[PDB]
Amino acid sequence: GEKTAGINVRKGGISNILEELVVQPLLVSVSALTLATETVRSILKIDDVVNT
Amino acid sequence: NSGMNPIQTMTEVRARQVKEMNPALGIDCLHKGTNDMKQQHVIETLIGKKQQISLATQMVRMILKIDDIRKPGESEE
Amino acid sequence: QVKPYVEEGLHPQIIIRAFRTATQLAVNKIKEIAVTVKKADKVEQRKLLEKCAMTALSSKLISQQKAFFAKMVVDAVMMLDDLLQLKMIGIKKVQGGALEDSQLVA
Amino acid sequence: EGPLSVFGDRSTGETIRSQNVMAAASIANIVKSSLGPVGLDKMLVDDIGDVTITNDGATILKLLEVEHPAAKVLCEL
Amino acid sequence: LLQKGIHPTIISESFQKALEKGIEILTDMSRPVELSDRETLLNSATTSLNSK
Amino acid sequence: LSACSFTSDMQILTASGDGTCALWDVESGQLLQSFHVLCLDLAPNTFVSMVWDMRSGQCVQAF
Amino acid sequence: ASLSLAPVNIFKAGADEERAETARLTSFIGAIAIGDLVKSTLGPKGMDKILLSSGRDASLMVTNDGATILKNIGVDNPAAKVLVDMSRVQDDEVGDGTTSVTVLAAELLREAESLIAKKIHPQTIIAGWREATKAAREALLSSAVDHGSDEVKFRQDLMNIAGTTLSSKLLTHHKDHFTKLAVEAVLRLKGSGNLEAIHIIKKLGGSLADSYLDEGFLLDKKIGVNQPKRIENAKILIANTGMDTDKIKIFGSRVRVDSTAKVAEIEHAEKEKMKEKVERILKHGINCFINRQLIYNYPEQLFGAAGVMAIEHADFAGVERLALVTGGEIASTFDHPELVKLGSCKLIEEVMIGEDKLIHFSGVALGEACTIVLRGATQQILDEAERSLHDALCVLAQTVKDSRTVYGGGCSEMLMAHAVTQLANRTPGKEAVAMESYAKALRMLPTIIADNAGYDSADLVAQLRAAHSEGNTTAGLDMREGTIGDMAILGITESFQVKRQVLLSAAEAAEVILRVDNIIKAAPRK
Amino acid sequence: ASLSLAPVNIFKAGADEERAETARLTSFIGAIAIGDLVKSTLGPKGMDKILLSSGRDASLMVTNDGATILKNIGVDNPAAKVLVDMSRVQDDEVGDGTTSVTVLAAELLREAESLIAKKIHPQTIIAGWREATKAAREALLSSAVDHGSDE
Amino acid sequence: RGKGAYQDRDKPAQIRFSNISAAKAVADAIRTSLGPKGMDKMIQDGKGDVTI
Ligand SMILES: Nc1ncnc2c1ncn2[C@@H]1O[C@H](COP(=O)(O)OP(=O)(O)O)[C@@H](O)[C@H]1O
Numbered sequence A: 001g002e003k004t005a006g007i008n009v010r011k012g013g014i015s016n017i018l019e020e021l022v023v024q025p026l027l028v029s030v031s032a033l034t035l036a037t038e039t040v041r042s043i044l045k046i047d048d049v050v051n052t
Numbered sequence B: 001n002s003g004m005n006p007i008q009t010m011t012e013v014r015a016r017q018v019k020e021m022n023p024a025l026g027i028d029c030l031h032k033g034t035n036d037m038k039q040q041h042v043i044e045t046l047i048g049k050k051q052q053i054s055l056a057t058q059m060v061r062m063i064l065k066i067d068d069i070r071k072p073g074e075s076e077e
Numbered sequence C: 001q002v003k004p005y006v007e008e009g010l011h012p013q014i015i016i017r018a019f020r021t022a023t024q025l026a027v028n029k030i031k032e033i034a035v036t037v038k039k040a041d042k043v044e045q046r047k048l049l050e051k052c053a054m055t056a057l058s059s060k061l062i063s064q065q066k067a068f069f070a071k072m073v074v075d076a077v078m079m080l081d082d083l084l085q086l087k088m089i090g091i092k093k094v095q096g097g098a099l100e101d102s103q104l105v106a
Numbered sequence D: 001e002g003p004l005s006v007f008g009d010r011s012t013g014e015t016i017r018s019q020n021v022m023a024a025a026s027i028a029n030i031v032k033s034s035l036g037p038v039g040l041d042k043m044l045v046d047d048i049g050d051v052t053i054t055n056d057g058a059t060i061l062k063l064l065e066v067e068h069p070a071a072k073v074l075c076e077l
Numbered sequence E: 001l002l003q004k005g006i007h008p009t010i011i012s013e014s015f016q017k018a019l020e021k022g023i024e025i026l027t028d029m030s031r032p033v034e035l036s037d038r039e040t041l042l043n044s045a046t047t048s049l050n051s052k
Numbered sequence F: 001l002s003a004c005s006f007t008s009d010m011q012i013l014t015a016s017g018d019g020t021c022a023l024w025d026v027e028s029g030q031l032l033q034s035f036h037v038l039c040l041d042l043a044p045n046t047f048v049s050m051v052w053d054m055r056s057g058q059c060v061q062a063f
Numbered sequence G: 001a002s003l004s005l006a007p008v009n010i011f012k013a014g015a016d017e018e019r020a021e022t023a024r025l026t027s028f029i030g031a032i033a034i035g036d037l038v039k040s041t042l043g044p045k046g047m048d049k050i051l052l053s054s055g056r057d058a059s060l061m062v063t064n065d066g067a068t069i070l071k072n073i074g075v076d077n078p079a080a081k082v083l084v085d086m087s088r089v090q091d092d093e094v095g096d097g098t099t100s101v102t103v104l105a106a107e108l109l110r111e112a113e114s115l116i117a118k119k120i121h122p123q124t125i126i127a128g129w130r131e132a133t134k135a136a137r138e139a140l141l142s143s144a145v146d147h148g149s150d151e152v153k154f155r156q157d158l159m160n161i162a163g164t165t166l167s168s169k170l171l172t173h174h175k176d177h178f179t180k181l182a183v184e185a186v187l188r189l190k191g192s193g194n195l196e197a198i199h200i201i202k203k204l205g206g207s208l209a210d211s212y213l214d215e216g217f218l219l220d221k222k223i224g225v226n227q228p229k230r231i232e233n234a235k236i237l238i239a240n241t242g243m244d245t246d247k248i249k250i251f252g253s254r255v256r257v258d259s260t261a262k263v264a265e266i267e268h269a270e271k272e273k274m275k276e277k278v279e280r281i282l283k284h285g286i287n288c289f290i291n292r293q294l295i296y297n298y299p300e301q302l303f304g305a306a307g308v309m310a311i312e313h314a315d316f317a318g319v320e321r322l323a324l325v326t327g328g329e330i331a332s333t334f335d336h337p338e339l340v341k342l343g344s345c346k347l348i349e350e351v352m353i354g355e356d357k358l359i360h361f362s363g364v365a366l367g368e369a370c371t372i373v374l375r376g377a378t379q380q381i382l383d384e385a386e387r388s389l390h391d392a393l394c395v396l397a398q399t400v401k402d403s404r405t406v407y408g409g410g411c412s413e414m415l416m417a418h419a420v421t422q423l424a425n426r427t428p429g430k431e432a433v434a435m436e437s438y439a440k441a442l443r444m445l446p447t448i449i450a451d452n453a454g455y456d457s458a459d460l461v462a463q464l465r466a467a468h469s470e471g472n473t474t475a476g477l478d479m480r481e482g483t484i485g486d487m488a489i490l491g492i493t494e495s496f497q498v499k500r501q502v503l504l505s506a507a508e509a510a511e512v513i514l515r516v517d518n519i520i521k522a523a524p525r526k
Numbered sequence H: 001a002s003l004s005l006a007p008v009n010i011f012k013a014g015a016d017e018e019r020a021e022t023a024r025l026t027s028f029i030g031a032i033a034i035g036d037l038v039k040s041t042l043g044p045k046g047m048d049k050i051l052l053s054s055g056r057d058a059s060l061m062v063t064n065d066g067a068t069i070l071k072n073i074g075v076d077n078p079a080a081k082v083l084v085d086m087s088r089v090q091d092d093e094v095g096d097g098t099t100s101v102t103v104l105a106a107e108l109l110r111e112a113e114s115l116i117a118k119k120i121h122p123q124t125i126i127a128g129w130r131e132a133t134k135a136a137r138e139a140l141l142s143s144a145v146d147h148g149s150d151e
Numbered sequence I: 001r002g003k004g005a006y007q008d009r010d011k012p013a014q015i016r017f018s019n020i021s022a023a024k025a026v027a028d029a030i031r032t033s034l035g036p037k038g039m040d041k042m043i044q045d046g047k048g049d050v051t052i
């Protein structure tokens, strides 16, 4: 049920990551997902390589 | 190899094997209509399967245990 | 470990003498604390041999069958008479077969 | 070479760390003999007979021809 | 996925659906911020600078 | 770079194996217009490489 | 006795010639190889190709366009060169059909080699193909439908045509959004055919669905230093003047004095001339000033002190697009302020797109010029999206020029081939066989379309043939699930011009290549 | 991934590997070349060939026999080798029909190439050809006439 | 029904596999430099320039 839980390098295990003040803007993750998915979709449409 | 869809056919055969206890259901490669290999008379020796599994496991163990290669790299003629 | 002292001009003879002293002390300690049992019964002697063989074998690709091979090795060695020639233990390798198919013939 | 497909060499892990430490130790051992009142100077022939006699570490490391980046770091230091 | 016999177009469409669902999930996770909250900005910058 | 015929010293004509000559000026340093090469002879506001026109930025006489 | 196979040698070193069988073999092999390469990129389920340049830059290019694929390949087979030139000319004439025409020519030449193997003189094949082309063309013309009178039906036709054009390309992911985008961009031209009036800006980053058509115009230039960065109710003045140490055009003139005081006076006179020119420009009563050439520091400072934006170095395309979108006049003299029209827009400002700043024109007066912003994940994605939009805009402009439309999805090919078969059934001799081969290639086109989708092409093509012979003139492939259906309801439509051009160009190239019986090559330079 | 198209090089120098479409292309090309070469020497109006050897003696041989044409040539295509061995075995079994069997095999493989181009699995082609061979053999046997009783 | 389309051409599958292998190799190469415990890389160009 807890969603603010992540890798805690300082403690060495799993803890509420907000206690370590490890936060990042949502735009970074959203852009990462969108761009990676678009690149994968573009690559999946390729089926031949031609040397110019 | 028989042109059928792999994942769908394998999933259906596995589900049929789980539903009714029948370890004789396989892949209808020749399209005879039925999936029961006991009726289709597709028979292999037990020793063959046991040897296949054993040899594959041992060779995979060897390949996994190797973590270093020292080739001469001379590319000799 | 002795490299840093070598770099700072320590005489090699001192290092050699220290190594000899430490090695003598360690060997004496090993001989002192090594566990031996003075009962001379065959059952626990065979158990000791099997345990030593398993430990020696638990680093190789046959480690999964180390008990089987260890028992076979113990039997093979115990069938040797008094000098334990290696040439009296034939080893034939036949391609094809599982490790568990290996056999020892009396 | 391999799936990475980069036109060049690649060292990873303990190998590159050891190489960097070796380069730094080489630079240190070059000038280790010129430290303290019981230190001694050095001659630096400049490939055409020019001679530079010095004890200053900066001059020695600047006049030397170094190629390893981890050693250029110490020279610039 | 391809080794099982799945056409790349199906894979791309499924990945698009997964990306849309993931964007929704990430948006549901996040919380709003105010530029007057200096502590949040400092924490974001520090999280950016831990790996460097 | 093959051709760097400095010009009217207000402008510089430069070209290389790219195949598209570039018109630069000295003061501003901005590429005025890249004309879509080994020679950059000027008028013996126009130049020949194909004759190009400054006033229109297009080839006017081909031979 | 052959020219090359003779006791005496009649050629230079390196020259070569191939007689009838060898020349036909070479031509057919080259053409079939080109057709096989360009195909499998055809139809809604066609895939893309990667073009690795071997040059210094090693440019990377992934594309689905047949013309682009055929352009950037090293071709030595002369017949393949003929087909490549065909594809290029087809691209120049109309936006789409580059792959279809090449595939049709390749299939025609394959049927031609079959007929030659069946001991048929190539002239008979050519005559039969000419008759078949005439019949197919007249049938396709009879099948055309026009909706230019009804504005709503014409807009629906534009929607369908843009969707069909974008179906094969990478934009099929957001086909609906991109179809609306392209249709609006074309309709904003107010009937003009100027495809250069539509500017496509490719900015890296962001999703492909973030691409949009700006309601006004976007300029990628910069404003001066002291000039304002935002103007409401702008009064545009578009110019093509010097604004940069504009020397008097008497090139034989020079300053020759006997004192530096006179030199300073002449310098002040030059500066006063520039100031008077700027005052004459400002007499028009303007807020913004776009010049095609550069603006130096003194006129820039004067404009800034006047509170006027001075956008500089807007090239010929830039000033033309600004004139089209704002209604201004590209002036070069300012002695008659009342005779020059000024462009107008509600607002000018700077916008932040990605990491680059651009000038935004909002609330434009005329708007007969569009700026389409493309956002993508890679440079290759942006380039392919630009190519797909170019194809869609070209086809939409052609449809605007000529509103006649024909049904796609193999329907046109089935109808033309059915007409050809009907003609062949009434023709005696081997011309009937040639006509049947022509129809066979026409069927092979949607057969390849269905092959690219993984469907059962034989059954689908048989069903299409039966439906078209029965009288169902609008039957076609339904790629959504893999059946046949009515192309009118499904809204699969394409320009009549494009299909007719594809058919005619393919027939012409097949006839030209088939006429060849000898290939003679001169010694190359290398 | 295939052996040749893998980042690691798994073969000796000079050894290669041809996958499905390439192997079919090479096999069909070799078979069609053999069939086209051996034909035109078929039927009453067939013409003969000249076999000029490249050896030191440079043996000259004019011939109409398909088996002699096929055996006395430098064959590198493995499918062409299969057809050549077929012709030799046919000659060994009976003295005639070498050209006929070679041409029939070449035509069958040409039709197989067309069928493969039409997206048909080769096992289906093989099963259909087995049925066709059964039918044709039965028809030919039923068509045979014997006159050994009357001298 | 029986068998479906044969798919005589194997080149598209090889192209897809090679593209995936290259992408996976790049991801594995840069994997080590992720997170607060990630480590930098030193790259020496053909010109001899060095960057960390
Ligand atoms: N949604 C669709 N359904 C059926 N067929 C289509 C569809 N979209 C395009 N096609 C067909 O695909 C063919 C090829 O179009 P495309 O590959 O986009 O450009 P080109 O005509 O240059 O090959 C056209 O002849 C068209 O009939």
Ligand SMILES: Nc1ncnc2c1ncn2[C@@H]1O[C@H](COP(=O)(O)OP(=O)(O)O)[C@@H](O)[C@H]1O
Residues within 6 Å of the ligand: H041, H042, H043, H044, H046, H066, H096, H097, H098, H099, H100, H101
């Ligand atoms: N007089 C003939 N009329 C019609 N067909 C013939 C005649 N003589 C031979 N043939 C046909 O020519 C074919 C080829 O025979 P031939 O050219 O001798 O080579 P091979 O017998 O090795 O195939 C045979 O199948 C035969 O049916």
Ligand SMILES: [Mg+2]
Residues within 6 Å of the ligand: G096, G097, G164, G165, G166, G168, G391
């Ligand atoms: Mg198209």
